[PDB]
Amino acid sequence: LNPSCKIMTFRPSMEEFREFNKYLAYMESKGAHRAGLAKVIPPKEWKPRQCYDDIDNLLIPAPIQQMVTGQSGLFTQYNIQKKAMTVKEFRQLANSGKYCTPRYLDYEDLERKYWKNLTFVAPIYGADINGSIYDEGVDEWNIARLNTVLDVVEEECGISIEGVNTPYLYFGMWKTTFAWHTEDMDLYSINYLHFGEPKSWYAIPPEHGKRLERLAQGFFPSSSQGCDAFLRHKMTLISPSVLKKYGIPFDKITQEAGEFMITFPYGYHAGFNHGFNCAESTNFATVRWIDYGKVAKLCTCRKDMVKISMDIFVRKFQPDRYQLWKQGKDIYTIDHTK
Numbered sequence: 001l002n003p004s005c006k007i008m009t010f011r012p013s014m015e016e017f018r019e020f021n022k023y024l025a026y027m028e029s030k031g032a033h034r035a036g037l038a039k040v041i042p043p044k045e046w047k048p049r050q051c052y053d054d055i056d057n058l059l060i061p062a063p064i065q066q067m068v069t070g071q072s073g074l075f076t077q078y079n080i081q082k083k084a085m086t087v088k089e090f091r092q093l094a095n096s097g098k099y100c101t102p103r104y105l106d107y108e109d110l111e112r113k114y115w116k117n118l119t120f121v122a123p124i125y126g127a128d129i130n131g132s133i134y135d136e137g138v139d140e141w142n143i144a145r146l147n148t149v150l151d152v153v154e155e156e157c158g159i160s161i162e163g164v165n166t167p168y169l170y171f172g173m174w175k176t177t178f179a180w181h182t183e184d185m186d187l188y189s190i191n192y193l194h195f196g197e198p199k200s201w202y203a204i205p206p207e208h209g210k211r212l213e214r215l216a217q218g219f220f221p222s223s224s225q226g227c228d229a230f231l232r233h234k235m236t237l238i239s240p241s242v243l244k245k246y247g248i249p250f251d252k253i254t255q256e257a258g259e260f261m262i263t264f265p266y267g268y269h270a271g272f273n274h275g276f277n278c279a280e281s282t283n284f285a286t287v288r289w290i291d292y293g294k295v296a297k298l299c300t301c302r303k304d305m306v307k308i309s310m311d312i313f314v315r316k317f318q319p320d321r322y323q324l325w326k327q328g329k330d331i332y333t334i335d336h337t338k
């Protein structure tokens, strides 16, 4: 049990690291999910790719220029699509004087500069790129093939996962942002920083996520009246100063190159990149997630958001509740600590 709901860091030996599914069960048995986010540092011997040199030639089809509007810790973001770029040209852009990381003392100093400089030069994010850059044959923690409940349902029952268990690449530069959100259907996610500058994360315990939602509804009431789950648009920024002021419990942590971050069901998170970097991530599920997916609040203003039917999961893994659930009588409130 993790009663403070603080973000945990794990350093498994190679023997402990080999099987991701087993280690994830271990992390939750230590209460790691109560923070909504955890870090895993793999042993120094492990390498998902021997050489990153040829990633320079990888094409970024639709780089995103992030426009931020607002003031004093409350901002809305929108995106402007830019012309296709290779990684090499993106890296040179990121390291130019207009876009490079500012000088800083420590991560805390840099965090301050992030929140002070959001509304000046708009950073460009090479985000949401289909693909993986693991070497072929890496069997440990292969983001492209984790073999979780999502995969079992797709391969054995022939049910469309809607591409949420496929890998995505993120080429960041300084000040590029991911806004406050939980994952689609309130799924888990895993994120590996292949190389480059760090990525800083903010996390809200699942047991306090509703308080973040109430706070955001009061500060963005127009966004709120337009969509019940508007935070899923990933356009809402709220600074740690605002969260402290209104008593929202949260934690922060910086992910360095070579480290995994895992987000848990209904764990709100947000953050920013320190500089040029490259990350890979996917969504996944465990049996524990099923009760979250059954009550996840979905986006009601856009046509084809990611909506996965829960029927197969309840029928196969919750046989004792299936008919009650389809009857509308499977009433419960989630215990985020178990």
Ligand SMILES: CCN(/C=C/N(C)C)C(=O)CNCc1cc(C(=O)O)ccn1
Pocket (backbone or CB within 6 Å): 127, 128, 168, 170, 177, 178, 183, 184, 189, 190, 191, 199, 269, 279, 281, 282, 283
């Ligand atoms: C599993 C990857 N994924 C699926 C992308 N599709 C929505 C396009 C996500 O939505 C991840 N959630 C956004 C996000 C982005 C970042 C980031 O910008 O590095 C960090 C944490 N979370």
Ligand SMILES: [Cl-]
Pocket (backbone or CB within 6 Å): 102, 113, 117
């Ligand atoms: Cl700056």
Ligand code: NI
Pocket (backbone or CB within 6 Å): 181, 182, 183, 189, 263, 269
């Ligand atoms: Ni995310």
Ligand SMILES: [Zn+2]
Pocket (backbone or CB within 6 Å): 226, 227, 228, 229, 230, 233, 299, 300, 301, 302
């Ligand atoms: Zn919506």
